[PDB]
Short mmCIF file of C-alpha atoms in Angstrom, two decimals:
data_model
loop_
_atom_site.label_atom_id
_atom_site.label_comp_id
_atom_site.label_asym_id
_atom_site.label_seq_id
_atom_site.Cartn_x
_atom_site.Cartn_y
_atom_site.Cartn_z
CA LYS A 1 -0.02 -0.01 0.00
CA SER A 2 2.84 2.46 0.83
CA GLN A 3 4.60 1.88 -2.43
CA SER A 4 1.41 2.13 -4.42
CA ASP A 5 0.70 5.52 -2.63
CA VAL A 6 4.20 6.76 -3.51
CA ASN A 7 3.68 5.83 -7.17
CA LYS A 8 0.32 7.63 -7.21
CA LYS A 9 1.86 10.85 -5.70
CA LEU A 10 4.59 10.57 -8.42
CA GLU A 11 1.84 10.39 -11.01
CA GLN A 12 0.25 13.66 -9.82
CA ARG A 13 3.67 15.26 -9.80
CA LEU A 14 4.30 14.20 -13.40
CA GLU A 15 0.93 15.52 -14.50
CA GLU A 16 1.49 18.94 -12.73
CA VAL A 17 4.96 19.47 -14.24
CA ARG A 18 3.68 18.35 -17.69
CA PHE A 19 0.89 20.85 -17.55
CA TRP A 20 3.08 23.67 -16.58
CA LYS A 21 5.65 22.81 -19.25
CA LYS A 22 2.92 22.83 -21.78
CA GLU A 23 1.79 26.26 -20.54
CA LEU A 24 5.37 27.60 -20.84
CA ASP A 25 5.77 26.21 -24.33
CA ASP A 26 2.45 27.67 -25.64
CA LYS A 27 3.44 31.06 -24.19
CA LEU A 28 6.84 30.82 -25.76
CA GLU A 29 5.32 30.23 -29.19
CA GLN A 30 3.30 33.51 -29.04
CA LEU A 31 6.28 35.42 -27.56
CA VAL A 32 8.53 34.37 -30.47
CA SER A 33 5.70 35.26 -32.96
CA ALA A 34 5.36 38.74 -31.37
CA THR A 35 9.18 39.17 -31.65
CA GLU A 36 8.91 38.20 -35.40
CA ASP A 37 6.26 40.83 -35.91
CA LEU A 38 8.43 43.42 -34.15
CA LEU A 39 11.34 42.38 -36.46
CA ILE A 40 9.32 42.73 -39.63
CA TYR A 41 8.15 46.12 -38.46
CA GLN A 42 11.73 47.05 -37.79
CA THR A 43 12.65 46.11 -41.36
CA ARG A 44 9.77 48.34 -42.58
CA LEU A 45 11.19 51.19 -40.52
CA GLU A 46 14.67 50.62 -41.99
CA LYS A 47 13.09 50.76 -45.49
CA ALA A 48 11.35 53.97 -44.43
CA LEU A 49 14.57 55.67 -43.36
CA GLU A 50 16.53 54.48 -46.38
CA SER A 51 13.77 55.78 -48.70
CA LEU A 52 13.74 59.07 -46.77
CA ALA B 1 14.82 47.69 -30.52
CA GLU B 2 14.17 48.07 -26.79
CA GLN B 3 10.98 46.05 -27.07
CA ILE B 4 12.76 43.33 -28.98
CA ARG B 5 15.45 43.30 -26.31
CA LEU B 6 12.71 42.85 -23.58
CA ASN B 7 11.04 40.12 -25.58
CA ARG B 8 14.34 38.19 -25.92
CA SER B 9 15.14 38.60 -22.23
CA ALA B 10 11.74 37.04 -21.42
CA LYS B 11 12.60 34.38 -24.11
CA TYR B 12 15.78 33.57 -22.25
CA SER B 13 14.22 33.23 -18.80
CA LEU B 14 11.31 31.20 -20.17
CA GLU B 15 13.67 28.84 -22.00
CA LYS B 16 15.76 28.35 -18.82
CA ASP B 17 12.65 27.35 -16.87
CA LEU B 18 11.47 25.08 -19.80
CA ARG B 19 14.70 23.04 -19.98
CA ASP B 20 14.63 22.80 -16.23
CA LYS B 21 11.04 21.35 -16.59
CA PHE B 22 12.31 18.83 -19.13
CA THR B 23 15.20 17.49 -17.01
CA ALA B 24 12.93 17.32 -13.91
CA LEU B 25 10.42 15.43 -16.06
CA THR B 26 12.97 12.79 -17.12
CA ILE B 27 14.26 12.52 -13.52
CA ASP B 28 10.62 11.92 -12.35
CA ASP B 29 10.02 9.48 -15.24
CA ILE B 30 13.08 7.40 -14.07
CA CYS B 31 11.67 7.71 -10.55
CA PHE B 32 8.22 6.47 -11.55
CA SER B 33 9.53 3.59 -13.67
CA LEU B 34 11.39 2.04 -10.71
CA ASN B 35 9.82 -1.29 -9.67
CA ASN B 36 11.04 -3.65 -6.98
CA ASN B 37 13.14 -5.91 -9.22
CA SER B 38 14.57 -3.21 -11.52
CA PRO B 39 18.43 -3.15 -11.88
CA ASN B 40 20.71 -0.33 -10.76
CA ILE B 41 18.87 -0.06 -7.47
CA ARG B 42 21.32 0.40 -4.61
CA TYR B 43 21.78 1.34 -0.95
CA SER B 44 22.11 5.02 -0.49
CA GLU B 45 23.93 7.24 2.09
CA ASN B 46 22.87 10.21 4.22
CA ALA B 47 20.22 10.78 1.54
CA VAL B 48 17.14 11.37 3.59
CA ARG B 49 17.52 15.16 4.10
CA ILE B 50 15.56 18.35 3.32
CA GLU B 51 17.77 19.97 0.81
CA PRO B 52 19.49 23.30 1.78
CA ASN B 53 18.66 24.80 -1.71
CA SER B 54 15.10 23.49 -1.88
CA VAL B 55 11.89 25.53 -2.39
CA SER B 56 8.23 24.95 -1.57
CA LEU B 57 5.41 23.89 -3.84
CA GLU B 58 3.71 27.32 -3.51
CA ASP B 59 7.02 28.99 -4.44
CA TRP B 60 7.45 26.67 -7.41
CA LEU B 61 4.00 27.40 -8.70
CA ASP B 62 4.47 31.12 -8.08
CA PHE B 63 7.69 31.12 -10.10
CA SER B 64 6.05 29.38 -13.04
CA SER B 65 2.94 31.64 -12.98
CA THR B 66 5.18 34.77 -12.70
CA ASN B 67 7.22 33.62 -15.77
CA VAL B 68 4.02 32.99 -17.83
CA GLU B 69 2.48 36.31 -16.77
CA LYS B 70 5.69 38.22 -17.50
CA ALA B 71 5.98 36.67 -21.01
CA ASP B 72 2.29 37.52 -21.64
CA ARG B 73 2.79 41.09 -20.46
CA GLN B 74 5.72 41.57 -22.78
CA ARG B 75 3.54 40.18 -25.58
CA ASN B 76 0.86 42.75 -24.72
CA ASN B 77 3.52 45.52 -24.86
CA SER B 78 4.63 44.13 -28.15
CA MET B 79 1.13 44.34 -29.64
CA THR B 80 0.70 47.84 -28.29
CA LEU B 81 3.85 48.99 -29.88
CA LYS B 82 2.82 47.18 -33.13
CA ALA B 83 -0.33 49.33 -33.25
CA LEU B 84 1.64 52.48 -32.39
CA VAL B 85 4.26 51.77 -35.09
CA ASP B 86 1.53 51.13 -37.74
CA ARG B 87 -0.06 54.48 -36.80
CA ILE B 88 3.31 56.34 -36.88
CA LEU B 89 4.24 54.89 -40.37
CA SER B 90 0.77 55.70 -41.75
CA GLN B 91 0.91 59.25 -40.54
CA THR B 92 4.48 59.73 -41.79
CA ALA B 93 3.56 58.48 -45.34
CA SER B 94 0.41 60.71 -45.37
CA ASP B 95 2.39 63.83 -44.27
CA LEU B 96 5.10 63.23 -46.82
CA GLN B 97 2.60 62.64 -49.62
CA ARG B 98 0.51 65.65 -48.82
CA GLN B 99 3.59 67.96 -48.52
CA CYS B 100 4.93 66.72 -51.84
CA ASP B 101 1.59 67.31 -53.46
CA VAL B 102 1.30 70.90 -52.13
CA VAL B 103 4.81 71.67 -53.29
CA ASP B 104 3.92 70.35 -56.71
CA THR B 105 0.82 72.48 -56.81
CA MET C 1 68.42 4.05 -62.34
CA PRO C 2 66.82 7.46 -62.26
CA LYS C 3 63.42 8.44 -63.52
CA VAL C 4 62.36 12.18 -64.09
CA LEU C 5 65.00 14.57 -62.82
CA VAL C 6 64.90 17.97 -61.11
CA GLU C 7 64.06 21.10 -63.07
CA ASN C 8 67.74 22.24 -63.29
CA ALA C 9 69.20 19.80 -65.83
CA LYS C 10 69.87 22.72 -68.20
CA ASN C 11 72.10 24.33 -65.51
CA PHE C 12 73.48 20.94 -64.54
CA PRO C 13 76.79 20.29 -66.33
CA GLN C 14 76.80 16.47 -66.83
CA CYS C 15 79.85 16.68 -69.15
CA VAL C 16 81.94 16.51 -65.91
CA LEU C 17 79.67 15.31 -63.06
CA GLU C 18 77.48 12.24 -63.03
CA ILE C 19 73.83 11.88 -62.14
CA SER C 20 74.15 11.88 -58.37
CA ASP C 21 71.70 11.97 -55.42
CA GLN C 22 71.34 15.74 -55.31
CA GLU C 23 69.53 16.04 -58.66
CA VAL C 24 67.38 12.95 -58.96
CA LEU C 25 63.74 13.65 -58.09
CA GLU C 26 62.50 10.06 -58.47
CA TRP C 27 64.44 6.78 -58.64
CA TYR C 28 62.97 3.59 -60.18
CA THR C 29 61.22 1.64 -57.51
CA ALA C 30 59.04 -1.54 -57.32
CA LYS C 31 56.01 0.73 -57.77
CA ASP C 32 56.94 0.83 -61.45
CA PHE C 33 57.47 -2.88 -62.24
CA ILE C 34 53.93 -4.22 -62.14
CA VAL C 35 53.56 -6.92 -64.81
CA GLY C 36 50.87 -6.47 -67.39
CA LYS C 37 52.07 -3.13 -68.67
CA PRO C 38 54.85 -1.48 -70.71
CA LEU C 39 57.89 0.26 -69.33
CA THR C 40 60.42 2.71 -70.78
CA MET C 41 64.00 2.27 -69.63
CA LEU C 42 67.15 3.77 -71.11
CA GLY C 43 65.57 4.52 -74.50
CA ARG C 44 63.58 1.39 -75.17
CA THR C 45 60.28 -0.15 -74.13
CA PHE C 46 60.07 -3.34 -72.22
CA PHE C 47 56.52 -4.88 -71.89
CA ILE C 48 56.61 -6.88 -68.57
CA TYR C 49 54.39 -9.97 -68.65
CA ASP C 50 55.51 -12.32 -65.98
CA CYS C 51 57.07 -12.43 -62.52
CA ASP C 52 58.12 -15.16 -60.11
CA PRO C 53 55.61 -15.83 -57.32
CA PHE C 54 58.12 -14.39 -54.80
CA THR C 55 57.43 -11.08 -56.57
CA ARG C 56 53.74 -12.04 -56.60
CA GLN C 57 53.73 -12.54 -52.80
CA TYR C 58 55.70 -9.31 -52.39
CA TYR C 59 53.11 -7.40 -54.41
CA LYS C 60 50.24 -9.11 -52.53
CA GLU C 61 51.68 -8.17 -49.13
CA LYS C 62 53.16 -4.75 -49.77
CA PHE C 63 51.28 -2.85 -52.45
CA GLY C 64 47.94 -4.59 -52.23
CA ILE C 65 47.91 -5.83 -55.81
CA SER C 66 45.70 -9.03 -56.02
CA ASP C 67 45.03 -9.14 -59.82
CA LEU C 68 48.76 -9.57 -60.98
CA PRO C 69 48.25 -11.19 -64.33
CA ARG C 70 49.92 -13.42 -66.88
CA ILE C 71 50.43 -12.42 -70.56
CA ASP D 1 38.87 42.41 -25.91
CA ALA D 2 39.46 44.88 -28.75
CA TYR D 3 41.95 46.32 -31.11
CA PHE D 4 42.54 49.69 -32.83
CA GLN D 5 44.62 50.44 -35.90
CA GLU D 6 47.19 53.17 -35.85
CA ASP D 7 48.89 54.59 -38.95
CA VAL D 8 52.37 55.32 -37.68
CA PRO D 9 54.39 57.77 -39.85
CA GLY D 10 58.09 57.80 -40.69
CA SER D 11 58.80 54.23 -39.53
CA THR D 12 60.87 51.40 -40.93
CA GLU D 13 59.40 47.87 -41.39
CA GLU D 14 55.97 49.08 -40.25
CA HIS D 15 53.20 51.21 -41.72
CA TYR D 16 50.16 50.19 -39.64
CA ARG D 17 50.04 49.20 -35.98
CA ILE D 18 47.54 47.00 -34.02
CA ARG D 19 47.43 47.59 -30.32
CA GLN D 20 45.56 45.05 -28.02
CA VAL D 21 43.06 46.47 -25.50
CA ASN D 22 40.49 45.04 -23.05
CA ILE D 23 37.34 47.09 -22.56
CA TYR D 24 35.74 46.70 -19.11
CA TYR D 25 32.15 47.72 -18.35
CA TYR D 26 31.24 48.23 -14.66
CA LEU D 27 27.53 47.63 -14.08
CA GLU D 28 27.62 49.09 -10.58
CA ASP D 29 27.79 52.77 -11.86
CA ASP D 30 27.46 52.07 -15.63
CA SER D 31 31.13 53.06 -16.17
CA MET D 32 33.81 52.00 -18.64
CA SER D 33 37.57 51.51 -18.71
CA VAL D 34 40.13 50.52 -21.35
CA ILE D 35 43.16 48.66 -20.19
CA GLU D 36 46.06 47.83 -22.64
CA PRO D 37 47.96 44.57 -21.70
CA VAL D 38 51.60 44.95 -22.20
CA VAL D 39 53.67 43.00 -24.71
CA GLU D 40 57.25 42.57 -23.82
CA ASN D 41 59.55 44.22 -26.49
CA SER D 42 57.55 47.28 -27.44
CA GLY D 43 58.52 50.85 -26.81
CA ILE D 44 54.96 52.10 -26.46
CA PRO D 45 54.23 53.39 -22.89
CA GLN D 46 51.75 50.56 -22.42
CA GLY D 47 49.39 50.29 -19.41
CA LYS D 48 46.01 51.74 -18.70
CA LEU D 49 44.54 53.59 -21.53
CA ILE D 50 41.20 55.03 -20.34
CA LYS D 51 40.37 55.49 -16.68
CA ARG D 52 37.17 54.27 -14.99
CA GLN D 53 34.56 56.89 -15.82
CA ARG D 54 31.31 57.08 -17.85
CA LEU D 55 32.54 57.23 -21.44
CA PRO D 56 30.63 59.76 -23.65
CA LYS D 57 28.89 58.51 -26.77
CA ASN D 58 27.48 61.67 -28.57
CA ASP D 59 27.96 65.39 -28.56
CA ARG D 60 25.21 66.03 -26.01
CA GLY D 61 26.79 63.93 -23.30
CA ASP D 62 25.24 60.39 -23.26
CA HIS D 63 27.33 57.72 -21.66
CA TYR D 64 27.65 54.29 -23.34
CA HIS D 65 25.27 51.76 -21.87
CA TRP D 66 25.46 47.99 -22.09
CA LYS D 67 22.47 47.85 -24.44
CA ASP D 68 24.69 48.93 -27.38
CA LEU D 69 27.78 46.83 -26.54
CA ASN D 70 28.01 43.65 -28.52
CA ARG D 71 30.67 41.41 -29.99
CA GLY D 72 32.35 42.36 -33.24
CA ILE D 73 31.44 46.06 -33.27
CA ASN D 74 32.99 49.48 -33.80
CA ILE D 75 32.81 51.82 -30.83
CA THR D 76 34.31 55.30 -30.96
CA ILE D 77 35.57 57.13 -27.92
CA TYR D 78 37.88 60.22 -27.51
CA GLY D 79 38.70 60.17 -31.22
CA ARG D 80 39.70 56.52 -31.49
CA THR D 81 37.62 53.68 -32.92
CA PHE D 82 37.98 50.36 -31.05
CA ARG D 83 36.87 47.11 -32.67
CA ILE D 84 35.39 44.90 -29.98
CA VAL D 85 35.96 41.29 -30.99
CA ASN D 86 35.10 38.78 -28.24
CA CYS D 87 33.96 38.53 -24.62
CA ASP D 88 34.01 35.95 -21.81
CA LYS D 89 31.31 33.50 -20.59
CA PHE D 90 30.14 35.95 -17.89
CA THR D 91 29.57 38.75 -20.42
CA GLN D 92 27.94 36.27 -22.80
CA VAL D 93 25.44 34.95 -20.24
CA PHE D 94 24.68 38.49 -18.93
CA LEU D 95 23.97 39.78 -22.48
CA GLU D 96 21.83 36.80 -23.48
CA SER D 97 20.05 37.11 -20.14
CA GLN D 98 19.18 40.71 -20.72
CA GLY D 99 18.17 40.00 -24.30
CA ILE D 100 20.92 40.98 -26.71
CA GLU D 101 21.89 38.67 -29.55
CA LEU D 102 25.68 38.42 -29.78
CA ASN D 103 27.28 38.54 -33.25
CA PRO D 104 29.46 35.70 -34.43
CA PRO D 105 33.03 36.14 -33.19
CA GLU D 106 35.99 37.09 -35.44
CA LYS D 107 39.72 36.40 -35.28
CA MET D 108 41.92 38.74 -33.34
CA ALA D 109 44.17 40.99 -35.44
CA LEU D 110 47.95 40.59 -34.79
CA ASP D 111 50.71 43.13 -34.67
CA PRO D 112 53.29 42.63 -37.48
CA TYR D 113 56.05 44.05 -35.22
CA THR D 114 55.17 41.56 -32.54
CA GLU D 115 54.97 38.66 -35.02
CA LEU D 116 58.30 39.45 -36.67
CA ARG D 117 59.53 40.00 -33.08
CA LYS D 118 59.73 36.20 -32.61
CA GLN D 119 62.73 34.07 -32.46
CA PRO D 120 62.59 30.85 -34.52
CA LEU D 121 61.82 27.50 -33.00
CA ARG D 122 65.22 25.76 -32.50
CA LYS D 123 64.06 22.21 -32.71
CA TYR D 124 64.69 19.66 -35.44
CA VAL D 125 62.84 16.69 -36.80
CA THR D 126 65.06 13.54 -36.70
CA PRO D 127 65.65 11.62 -39.96
CA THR D 128 64.01 8.28 -40.88
CA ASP D 129 65.34 4.81 -40.00
CA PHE D 130 65.53 3.02 -43.38
CA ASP D 131 69.11 3.95 -44.17
CA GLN D 132 71.73 1.76 -45.86
CA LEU D 133 72.00 -0.59 -42.93
CA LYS D 134 68.28 -1.38 -42.60
CA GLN D 135 68.13 -1.70 -46.35
CA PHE D 136 71.03 -4.21 -46.26
CA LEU D 137 69.87 -6.06 -43.17
CA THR D 138 66.11 -6.34 -44.05
CA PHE D 139 66.01 -7.15 -47.84
CA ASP D 140 69.25 -9.03 -48.27
CA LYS D 141 69.12 -11.92 -50.87
CA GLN D 142 65.67 -10.59 -51.93
CA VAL D 143 65.34 -9.55 -55.52
CA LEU D 144 62.24 -9.12 -57.74
CA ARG D 145 62.53 -11.17 -60.91
CA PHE D 146 60.38 -10.29 -63.87
CA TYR D 147 59.99 -11.47 -67.54
CA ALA D 148 59.79 -8.76 -70.27
CA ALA E 1 18.89 -19.87 -16.68
CA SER E 2 15.64 -17.90 -16.03
CA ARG E 3 17.84 -15.14 -14.43
CA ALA E 4 19.89 -14.84 -17.67
CA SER E 5 16.66 -14.45 -19.57
CA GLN E 6 15.43 -11.86 -17.03
CA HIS E 7 18.67 -9.77 -17.48
CA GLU E 8 18.36 -9.84 -21.28
CA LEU E 9 14.75 -8.62 -21.07
CA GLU E 10 15.71 -6.14 -18.31
CA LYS E 11 18.41 -4.45 -20.52
CA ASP E 12 15.81 -4.55 -23.37
CA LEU E 13 13.23 -2.62 -21.37
CA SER E 14 15.92 -0.07 -20.29
CA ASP E 15 16.87 0.42 -24.04
CA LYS E 16 13.17 0.84 -25.01
CA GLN E 17 12.80 3.35 -22.17
CA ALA E 18 15.62 5.44 -23.59
CA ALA E 19 14.02 5.04 -27.05
CA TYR E 20 10.56 6.37 -26.02
CA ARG E 21 12.16 9.24 -24.08
CA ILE E 22 14.51 10.33 -26.95
CA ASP E 23 11.91 9.71 -29.70
CA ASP E 24 9.47 11.63 -27.48
CA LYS E 25 11.52 14.84 -27.21
CA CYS E 26 11.55 14.59 -31.00
CA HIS E 27 7.76 14.11 -31.51
CA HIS E 28 7.16 17.46 -29.71
CA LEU E 29 10.31 19.32 -30.74
CA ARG E 30 8.24 22.05 -32.53
CA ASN E 31 9.77 25.41 -33.64
CA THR E 32 10.37 27.87 -30.81
CA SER E 33 10.77 24.95 -28.44
CA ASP E 34 14.14 25.32 -26.65
CA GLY E 35 17.47 24.00 -28.34
CA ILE E 36 16.47 23.87 -32.09
CA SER E 37 20.13 24.52 -32.94
CA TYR E 38 21.65 24.60 -36.48
CA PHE E 39 23.80 21.39 -36.38
CA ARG E 40 25.59 20.41 -39.59
CA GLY E 41 25.85 16.77 -40.79
CA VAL E 42 22.72 15.19 -39.11
CA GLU E 43 21.88 13.82 -42.55
CA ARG E 44 25.49 12.77 -43.61
CA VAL E 45 25.83 10.93 -40.23
CA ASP E 46 24.09 7.49 -40.47
CA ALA E 47 24.97 4.38 -38.37
CA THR E 48 21.51 2.81 -37.68
CA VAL E 49 22.50 -0.71 -36.44
CA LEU F 1 15.50 23.01 -41.08
CA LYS F 2 16.89 23.75 -37.51
CA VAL F 3 14.03 21.56 -36.07
CA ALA F 4 14.91 18.52 -38.14
CA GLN F 5 18.65 18.89 -37.39
CA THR F 6 18.11 18.73 -33.61
CA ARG F 7 15.29 16.11 -34.22
CA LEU F 8 18.02 13.95 -36.01
CA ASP F 9 20.86 14.93 -33.56
CA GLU F 10 19.05 13.40 -30.56
CA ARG F 11 17.87 10.28 -32.42
CA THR F 12 21.54 9.57 -33.08
CA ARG F 13 22.10 9.20 -29.29
CA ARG F 14 19.66 6.30 -29.02
CA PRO F 15 21.47 3.32 -27.30
CA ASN F 16 22.41 -0.05 -28.91
CA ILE F 17 19.66 -1.73 -31.14
CA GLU F 18 17.24 1.29 -30.94
CA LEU F 19 19.28 3.07 -33.73
CA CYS F 20 16.98 1.79 -36.56
CA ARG F 21 16.40 3.14 -40.12
CA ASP F 22 12.79 3.99 -39.14
CA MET F 23 10.47 5.71 -41.62
CA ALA F 24 11.43 8.78 -39.54
CA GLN F 25 15.20 8.29 -40.28
CA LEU F 26 14.39 8.47 -43.99
CA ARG F 27 11.84 11.29 -43.69
CA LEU F 28 13.96 13.37 -41.25
CA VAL F 29 17.12 12.77 -43.49
CA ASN F 30 14.93 13.92 -46.44
CA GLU F 31 13.58 17.00 -44.54
CA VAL F 32 17.20 18.45 -44.14
CA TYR F 33 17.90 18.10 -47.85
CA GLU F 34 14.45 19.32 -49.05
CA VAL F 35 14.51 22.49 -46.85
CA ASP F 36 18.20 23.10 -47.81
CA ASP F 37 17.19 22.90 -51.47
CA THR F 38 14.09 25.07 -50.65
CA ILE F 39 16.27 27.83 -49.13
CA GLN F 40 18.58 27.45 -52.15
CA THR F 41 15.84 28.08 -54.75
CA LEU F 42 14.79 31.07 -52.68
CA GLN F 43 18.44 32.42 -52.57
CA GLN F 44 18.67 32.63 -56.39
CA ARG F 45 15.21 34.32 -56.52
CA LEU F 46 16.91 37.05 -54.39
CA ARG F 47 19.81 37.43 -56.84
CA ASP F 48 17.22 36.97 -59.76
CA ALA F 49 14.97 39.80 -58.57
CA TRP G 1 14.82 60.66 -83.48
CA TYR G 2 11.61 58.58 -83.79
CA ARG G 3 13.83 55.45 -83.74
CA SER G 4 15.51 56.52 -80.53
CA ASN G 5 11.97 57.66 -79.40
CA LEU G 6 11.00 54.01 -79.58
CA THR G 7 14.25 52.44 -78.17
CA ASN G 8 13.51 53.94 -74.75
CA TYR G 9 9.85 52.89 -74.87
CA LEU G 10 10.95 49.31 -75.68
CA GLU G 11 13.50 49.30 -72.81
CA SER G 12 10.81 50.39 -70.38
CA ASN G 13 8.14 47.88 -71.67
CA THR G 14 10.60 44.89 -71.63
CA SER G 15 12.24 45.78 -68.26
CA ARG G 16 8.86 46.61 -66.66
CA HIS G 17 7.28 43.28 -67.87
CA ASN G 18 10.38 41.25 -66.94
CA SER G 19 9.99 42.41 -63.32
CA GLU G 20 6.20 41.68 -63.19
CA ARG G 21 6.79 38.09 -64.38
CA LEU G 22 9.64 37.56 -61.79
CA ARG G 23 7.60 39.19 -59.02
CA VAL G 24 4.37 37.23 -59.85
CA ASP G 25 6.36 33.94 -60.01
CA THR G 26 8.31 34.88 -56.81
CA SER G 27 5.08 35.40 -54.79
CA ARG G 28 3.97 31.89 -55.82
CA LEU G 29 7.36 30.29 -55.02
CA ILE G 30 6.81 31.78 -51.54
CA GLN G 31 3.30 30.30 -50.92
CA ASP G 32 4.66 26.99 -52.41
CA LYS G 33 7.85 26.79 -50.16
CA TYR G 34 5.79 27.89 -47.11
CA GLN G 35 3.15 25.18 -47.71
CA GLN G 36 5.63 22.22 -48.32
CA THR G 37 8.05 23.20 -45.52
CA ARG G 38 5.10 23.17 -43.09
CA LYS G 39 3.76 19.91 -44.55
CA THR G 40 7.21 18.25 -44.66
CA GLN G 41 7.30 18.82 -40.85
CA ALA G 42 3.88 17.35 -40.46
CA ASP G 43 4.79 14.20 -42.41
CA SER G 44 8.11 13.86 -40.43
CA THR G 45 6.17 14.19 -37.19
CA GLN G 46 3.68 11.39 -37.87
CA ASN G 47 6.68 9.06 -38.53
CA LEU G 48 8.24 9.96 -35.10
CA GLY G 49 4.79 9.53 -33.53
#
């Protein structure tokens, strides 16, 4: 019974860390996408100064 | 450029925490896949000890939540600057076109 | 026997001195006498067709030739 | 670590000059210093080059920050133009932590006077072993017969 | 005899564990994940036993 | 491209047997090439335009 | 004069049209490469899965 209880507690710990890793990864996707939008807007500004 | 720097700093911290999550996950997978007759199981040492660099569950969840909300806040700032930059470019193009037209007239 | 010589034979006065070690770039070696091909020594062509199996074992064990033929 | 090119006039066996400097950025007060490590046989009064104070960047009196200090860049100060080449692991981890992509590193330019200021290596490579005595003791009574 | 069989299968499970784990990282290794470096030769190298 | 490279760099650390020419091995080895050729076509289009 | 008054016109026409064709085709090449590179990943992923 004690070993089964330890295994169950390990299962909840795995599920918790997996959920938070998924949350971090899904936020990283959008953070990198926002950085890419900032980079393309920076390229547009460089084109604006060069055409100026 | 400053907003890109802030986004990349948030990227660095978030990637730090994510690879820490992966190595903790593989440690816990090895822990969970340990049966009674598995090999490489051995007598330990002092072992049973609350670690002097350990943190609490509430502190761990607070750290993860703070990282997520910091990244989301920087994304919100990025979208706000995106709208501001779009307005600035449109205004600059309109002013230059109108001034060139009135000079030609 | 010397093969192709250094690029100073025009300056080298062989009316007095012989073909010594200082001016030979390549001497004739067993990497030349592989039977089944021609050869040009002195001023004439020898086509080499056979060798004794001592030479055959030498060429098997040193230069990796395993197709050493008979003509 | 950085270098700056000096066009020395009226000098034999030299027409340009590369001097090796380390550029330190103190985060405690956002200050800078430039130290010049000394090479042995050079008559330049080498030592410290720029003291620890906030180095100006523009005409209006802005100090250089760490947000515009990367690898492989040109930075001008007090007339001169240093070429920052590399940095250490601490500067790398700090800059990637604060969110600055570091440029790929380049190779460090070398002083011609220093590199012709080198003695030769006085070592020699010993000859082979297959001399006349090995050739007589190893392949004696061994000839290669052919038929032509 | 059975113990030798046990060991063989034991090492097998260990190998399959590494497999699942390594091939897992791969299955979810999407863009903007973590490492995603620009190695050179991953295609040239090939020693599948 | 970067994804496939790391995806193939870890699958080359699999232990003993595991290392198998799985459909992935082919597909992943293909990805690298394809994307490399893809980027190449695009590179000329730059010089072309 | 009328001959050199047509030369220029020709240059413009040709040059202008050349660009249009290249640009039109380039745009397509982009959608094409985008699609496949995304797909290739999808395929490679199912294999690893």
